[model samples]
Target: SVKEQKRFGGVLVFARGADGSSMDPALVTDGESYVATGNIYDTLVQFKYGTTEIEPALATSWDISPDGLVYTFHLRKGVYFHQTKYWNKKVEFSAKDVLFSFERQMDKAKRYYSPGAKSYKYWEGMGMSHIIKSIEALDDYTIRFTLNGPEAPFLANLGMDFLSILSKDYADYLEQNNKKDELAKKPVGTGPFKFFLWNKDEKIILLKNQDYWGPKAYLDKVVVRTIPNSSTRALALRTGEIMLMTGPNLNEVEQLEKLPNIVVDKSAGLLASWLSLNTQKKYFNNPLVRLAINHAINVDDYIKVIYEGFAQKMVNPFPPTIWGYNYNIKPYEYDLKKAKELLKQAGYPNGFKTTIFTTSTRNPKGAVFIQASLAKIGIDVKIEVYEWGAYLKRTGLGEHEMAFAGWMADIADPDNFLYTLWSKQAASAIPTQNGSFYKSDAFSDLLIKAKRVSDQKEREALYLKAQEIIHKDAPYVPLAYPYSVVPHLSKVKGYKTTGVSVNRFFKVYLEK
Candidate 1:
């Protein structure tokens, strides 16, 4: 039941570590950017609040062809695009906008393409082009998508942040003014909040959309402030400068939870943290070496000490909640004896020295844990740290032998978890998400086949096979699935921690 005393008109200030890379949904890859874009834009379909299940957003209803190749969406009429400085007048969103939004990403020959500027990284990275046949508009209120093959996760893909719809009129208006670059920076969409201002690295401000087609936001404004230091962010929350913030590190959680005015929420998240070994390296290329490293580290110690018993040890990349996770596989047990024997068998009785890189200060602790454990088996590990942006660029370039990294699911499907991390096509010159540079024809073929299978049981079987292959290869030492922890003021209500890491403030309100 809806709360009877829901009040409107309050501002929310969120303190986080980073700012978004781009405001445009098409180009966004980072979580900070996705959070901002998710507020300012609506997708054809949306994840039901606090769940992975798909629900209607722009498209009120949809139908799938029997052969599972075509999807027709019936868009809701009377939806209004947020008015911006570039588009001062009200623009009624229709099928043309949806067609324009997707075509601009999929088709290079379209007028909106700029030769030297950025391309759609998320689209190409996810390998969507191979599946999509064509996107067309049948009428003003309807749009149809024809796929080359049956993709079981197609609807789930549409709910991703990168697939957010844009107004065609606004895109055309920006192109006419020779300000194509402004389209992403100054976006106009039909969401609950409108873009107000982004003071780069300082803060991003959003205002409630009065003309929003759905239920009005309870808060009048939303402000996200970038505070890179966790201690500083926690201090801000204590001082009431920010009402909500990310939870403190595991060591500090008990102290923060004891505070009279604060509340901490924790749930199992759809994420996995791991140590990615660059398979191109001669030593790591050996499966025996990879398995030895996996067995050398004690992940249970990581959960008990580092995470304060808040995380579950992961055997494979997929978290327990995600569909298609293999239940038969078990995590590698910590065995110094077995690891040493494997090292000797692999012609390295004396374990080799290697460097492990980390981007975040929090992650270096995990690296240090591994460093100490590997030393027991004669493996000397050196830890190097860099800022997040530099770290991503360096790792992508294959500069390090091992990297302490993690992946939070963008969608609920196994393909998002498997393909995005291991696909051959996902590798880049400057490696972005796929840091291992690991490739296998058999692995890739299973994933490709899994994507086309329409039956859920059959798809699950295929994905299980893929997970088995990954387990055998051991390119990454599957680490732990940590709990999603968020700390907020006691007065804050209607806040739920989602596994996918979305912050929806539409229903959130202040009691005091």
Candidate 2:
């Protein structure tokens, strides 16, 4: 029966929230779009399933210039973009599509450029514009990317979802129809799954791509339902309405695990949850106050209570699993005496009242615990909750004194960890992720040097030094590297959790 089901068809219903701001890879800022774009499109190179290691995807192989300024990708032959309503004909994936996809971002004067379409958010956020000089299609099967300088992590960055290749034919079609903005709503790609339907605020449906060049997905269809409520997701799982879903709350994990039909898988994730202190705010401008805040909070206690001991306490901005993480740096010990002393030294002997902003329900409990801990050390914290969108907007504008926030690495690189969070440019211009608005010229210079160096060991040393500076400055209090837990039925085969927190359902199938 299992073999028969695998050969025929099965459906896997996943419980997740709404689609991201835009389904267009270039404009997406959230994980929902990242996962969807990842399924619908292919990059020149890709992170191997279940690992951070880069592997061939749309391009079978490539060569980098000795100077590392130029990368030439050899396109995979016979790859076809998904046949959709916009392009109901077979569109052979080629170098033109690859060049078109990149040129649209690098050159605004390109014919397909839409007036109001946001430039690639992640590309600009990561400062790729500073590195990339131009992109060209050398031949039908060849595409070359010229870089302004040698970037050691460029290949890894290419594997990110924002860089997913788009079919040139589809782009031209949208332009001809005068519906350029609608490109994000309708997508065409070369992947294992094809976009079926996207019901905004409801669900996204995808069907297996029968003509996919790679291994075909075992499941005939995948239905991703928008269940924002955790309890409702749990209920759906219990009723067998969904075969797989993100793990339940820490408190609910044991009960879910006890179910004979369910299995909860947990693994260390390449994500860091931290308490971001707005350095731009007067109260947080003092390093002593930031350090004091770090010392006052009992991170271990919060981990034990909120995470149920499923999380590892973090010592730095990046998780331990990420490259260049300084394992020697220890997390601040919870010491009310030291915290009070520091507060006194910072001219806050009487303590001061401030507000901390949080968007998610998961954060409020931790915020309350932090509130209690800081109260003892003379800091009165007011917790203000907002919707996710509002929270991001407020934090980005530097409207809060302290904020509960986190960062998940798009790729496994030291630059991705260090540069994104601490770079002066990121803090000044890209305030979305660098909510702390922390800036240091010395730190930014070290990161720039790290990116330019081709030698891995030298780059690692530079990143380690940069992390040391960040740790000492205390722009944010490192909280914990929480584990990613996915709960699914035992009969669900080939489903595995990734450190990056992406759901890859291409190889998953149900068995009864």
Candidate 3:
């Protein structure tokens, strides 16, 4: 039966995507599906396969010098970009292309226009500036990355979608024509799929890359259709118009499972969505006030009611799966009396009013249910929902007094989530730094030490201290790790999901 279903080359994927016109990774800010689409468009220098970092796809392998500053990479030869109408021809991928991608991200002009530049600030902040002291082209096949410091996570950064290599021709086209808007719509990359066509309300189509350097793709094409209505998406799967649909609503999951041929693929989400206070703000500066807010809301009820067991209640901002998660530190349970007492001690006998800026599209029904839960605490909460791009820009700049910010683990390391948002880097122009304006010299020092120490035991201990400081300050109140619900037809083969952030479609085939 499985072999019989394998007649089709590729499976059709349907989704409720955002109001975007393009599939460019650099311009994807609206939702996960858009970001996922961008992942298919470009190639990351390193591939993160499970917990261990592996060099595959775009890069063959790399040797980190003993000093940790110099990184020599052996580029995969004969790799070519998926030919597109933009290039009008096939182009070989090279070290120079990789160099340009990173450089463009750092360019102030490009950063201003690139929506994904916010993520690259980590590369700029994480001593990437030092580790990549200079990116050199020894030849077409060899490239050397010189650093300013011993950067262990440099390879990990390379694996991020923001660092995915872009075509020089594509970059030049955007630069020469001043076509930021148009470029965002038409992205070109060296991946297994090539951009074909996208109809505004219908679908996005991708053709297989014959020049793809790895195992040749099984499918001739992938059609990602936009089914704005969840009911329509579910019905499409039931009727067999689409084989897979990622990010389905919980209710839709239940409905889809009733279909005879439909299967629901639920993966534990890697992102931690939490309410973060701008500690720098005068109103939220008090620890008691922070603790009061923590005690005021019912986290468990919030999860149970809104997520319906689709999310796991989190105590720390860092996921337990992440390194340095302190199982010793317990979560603060909901205590209304304790919350009122804390508020009184903080001079708020009656809880004060505050704004909680949140993305309406993040959770089930867009966190509206969470806002109602917070209102029961006597805290007059205002939920300001913004378009994805606007929300990212404002939140990244510490503009919100209190906000719901989330961090998807950039790498497997605790630093990927903890240090990335610890707040010391916020003051800098870099937007990737935690927007909460959380500042502590001690926390910063511990994070720095953790990064430098090669010893796992000592480094993990420092991470624990860093997490403790974050929890105590309540710059972030842990909510829950949401799960990704994907529905697929039973005939789809090699359909796998991981915390890798990008869904690898090349491994999939339609069972005949």
Candidate 4:
């Protein structure tokens, strides 16, 4: 069977995502982009196969200063970048490539820093430039990073897809021909896969890297097709149109369980389904208004109806399954009368009308559920659906009264949730994800202190306090933390799922 399977070769057609809005991680925020970029690019550090544990990637090893403000990394030799149409030379990966990858995001004046990358969502979201004061290459294989202060999440931040290294040589090639925009469009990285062709709304194909630094990819080719409909995604899988899928509906779980050929694996992911209230808005400026809204919605019913027991109703931003979740905190009780009373005390004797903006990819039905619940509190709610691109644009501009969104973990740490979603710095970043834009000095201060301390015990206490501040502030009505569904053919083997967004395919194989 193994021999027959190999003779047939491997071409996995997975139906789970659409094309990323941008291929380069410098400006990417959505998951679709990572579906491609996560494969093509390699970070200096990377998560172990499917686990959050940090391990070496491009960098063989590293040294950190006792003060923790500096890091010296020794790069691996002989790692090769993929040959692209623009770059034909057999260029080796170097510290220069890492510098080019980061400098483009750190400083806009850099030659390869295109206009599209000005936002640098995750970079600015995590305040990397503020953390990293300077990066210098001591030699071709050696590099150093000097930080403004001790950063607790520094290593994990480097492991994330947003910090993925780019080819400096390929970047120069693109710039020499005035094809700067293509840097994000086409990629050349030292990973186990190379970009082949991506026909958006159809398929994004990748070929295996023949001369990889580590173990070569098992599959010869991997294809991700665009199938937005959930039931139809399963239909395509059953019909053999696609070999794997990322997210499957719970309604189909029992039937899928009955099918011998299909395997539905639920990965307990670091994802939270929540609504962000625009803190700058008239009524939402009050903390009591936000809390009243939180108390009105029944997340228990939400989990039962929408998630169908696949998710846990969460009070904190990150799930309790993850480390540093404040165990003492509890969800706001669903009390309609108290909610109405709270609204009246907040100066809105009669709650006003508002809109909830969401994308088709999210829980659009929950907006109606929220609407029905809020109606009891005298608030009229309207549901507005925007295309993905427009939704990002609209919410980024803070044009929405309320926005439904999810945070897929960039790292396993509580810092990943606290800083990226709640910090004022993440809110101020261009093309921001924090639509609420709530600037809590107490909340942000806790994060800053937590970042400087190396000890997890101190850091844990700080995060617990951070959650208390946010919970009292009520910028978001925390909802369910759902498990990402991975439904694949039984033949697929050696694959792993991540709480983080990126899904790497190098280890995956098929057996007959």
Estimate, for each residue in 8-45, the C-alpha lDDT of model 2 and write its tens digit: 57888887644445667876566766667778888888
Q: Pick by lDDT: which candidate is best? A: 4
Each model's lDDT comes to: 0.83, 0.80, 0.68, 0.84
Q: Estimate each model's TM-score.
A: 0.94, 0.94, 0.88, 0.96
**Model 1, position 70: C-alpha lDDT score:** 97
Best by TM-score: 4
Q: What is candidate 1's CA lDDT for residue 243? A: 86
Tens digits of per-residue lDDT for model 1 on 1-512? Answer: 34544566699888787677788877656677776788889999988777788889999999999888999999999999998665798989999988888888788787385876366767777777877998888999999999998888899899888888988888888788898888888889899999999888789888899988888888999998888887888888888999888646677778888998999888888878888898888789899999899889888888887788888999878798887899998778899899999999999998899998976646347778888999999999998888766675677668889987777787888888788778776764233467787788898889989887778789899989999888888898887898888888988877778745367677778885
Candidates in descending TM-score order? 4, 2, 1, 3
Clashing pairs in model 4? none
Flag the better candidate by TM-score, 1 or 3: 1
